[PDB]
C-alpha cells in the first residue's frame, strides 16, 4: 500500500515458500552474471 508493497510480496506459495523452482527461473538468475 505504502511503498514497496505488501510485506510477503514476491514469494510464491507453490515455489519459493516450498523451496521449489519453476523450470526457467534459473535462466534469469544465470543472466544476472549468475545469482549464487
Amino acid at each position: 500500500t505504502f511503498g514497496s508493497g505488501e510485506a510477503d510480496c514476491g514469494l510464491r506459495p507453490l515455489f519459493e515458500k516450498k523451496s521449489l523452482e519453476d523450470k526457467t527461473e534459473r535462466e534469469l538468475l544465470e543472466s544476472y552474471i549468475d545469482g549464487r
Binding site: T1, F2, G3, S4, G5, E6, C9, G10, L11, R12, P13, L14, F15, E16, D22, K23, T24, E25, E27, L28, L29, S31, Y32, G35, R36
Partner: protein, 250 residues
C-alpha cells in the same frame, strides 16, 4: 506471447485478467500488487484514437487463472472495481509515455496458492537489476502470432536491451519512462508480448532476497516478434512515487 511456453500452475500468482462484461472478452493483463490494488497499462482503459474509454462498470478483474476461456470454479476470484486512476500525464497523443494505471477493487481478495501479490521495486533493486543483458519474464493470454490464442497462460523470458539499440529500431520517441527488451536478430532466440498482453507484468527475481519484483508493464511494440524490433514497457520504478501517492491518498 510469441515463442513462449505454457506456464505452470501458480507460476505467476499475480497475473490478473481485465475482462469486459459485454461483449465478454479479454482486454488486457494486469498484476496484483496488494489485496486491493491492480496495476495495468493506461492504454488498456483509455485510448481516444480508437474510442476506448472504459469505466469501472465495464470491467471485471479475474484473478487466480491459468486457462484463458474457462471459469475455474473454486480457484479464480472475480472483483469489480471501485476506482480507476490513470497517470495525469499519460501521453496517448504521441508515444504512450507514462502508460500506467491503477484500479482499486471493490473488496479485498483473499490470497491463495494461486493468488499472491508481486513486489514493486525500490531504487536499489531497480539499480541492480535493470541492466542490459539481464532477463525478465512476461506472461499473458494474448496472441501467439502477430496474425492463434492460447488455452493456458504463456510465459517467455527476454533480455533488456541497451537504450541506444531500442531508440535505433523505431521512429517513435523513447522517453526515460520506458525500456525495451527482446533478443537481437543475431541471438538465435525469439519471443515477445503481442496483442492481448498489454498491461501485464515484466518481472525479475532478485538474487539478494529471492523475491519477484515487477519492473515493467507491457506497453507497446510494432508488430509481434519482428526481427529488428523490440517490446517497450513502462518503467515502474520511475512512476513509483505516483503509485504511492494514489495508494495513500485514496
Amino acid at each position: 506471447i510469441v515463442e513462449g511456453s505454457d506456464a505452470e500452475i501458480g507460476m505467476s500468482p499475480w497475473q490478473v485478467m481485465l475482462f469486459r462484461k459485454s461483449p465478454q472478452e479479454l482486454l488486457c493483463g494486469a498484476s496484483l500488487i496488494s489485496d486491493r490494488w491492480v496495476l495495468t497499462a493506461a492504454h488498456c482503459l483509455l485510448y481516444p484514437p480508437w474510442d476506448k474509454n472504459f469505466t469501472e462498470n465495464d470491467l471485471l478483474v479475474r484473478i487466480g487463472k491459468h486457462s484463458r476461456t474457462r471459469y475455474e470454479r473454486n480457484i479464480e476470484k472475480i472483483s469489480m472495481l471501485e476506482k480507476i486512476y490513470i497517470h495525469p500525464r499519460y501521453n496517448w497523443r504521441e508515444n504512450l509515455d507514462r502508460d500506467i494505471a491503477l484500479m482499486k477493487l471493490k473488496k479485498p481478495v483473499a490470497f491463495s496458492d494461486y493468488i499472491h501479490p508481486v513486489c514493486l521495486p525500490d531504487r536499489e533493486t531497480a539499480a541492480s537489476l535493470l541492466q542490459a543483458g539481464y532477463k525478465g519474464r512476461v506472461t499473458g493470454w494474448g496472441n501467439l502470432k502477430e496474425t492463434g490464442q492460447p488455452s493456458v497462460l504463456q510465459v517467455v523470458n527476454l533480455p533488456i536491451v541497451e537504450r541506444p539499440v531500442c531508440k535505433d529500431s523505431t521512429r517513435i520517441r523513447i522517453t526515460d519512462n520506458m525500456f525495451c527488451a527482446g533478443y537481437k536478430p543475431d541471438e538465435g532466440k525469439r519471443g515477445d508480448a503481442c496483442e492481448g498482453d498489454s498491461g501485464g507484468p515484466f518481472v525479475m527475481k532478485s538474487p539478494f532476497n529471492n523475491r519477484w519484483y515487477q519492473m515493467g508493464i507491457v506497453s507497446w511494440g510494432e508488430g509481434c516478434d519482428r526481427d529488428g524490433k523490440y517490446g517497450f514497457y513502462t518503467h515502474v520504478f520511475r512512476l513509483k512515487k505516483w503509485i504511492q501517492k494514489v495508494i495513500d491518498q485514496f
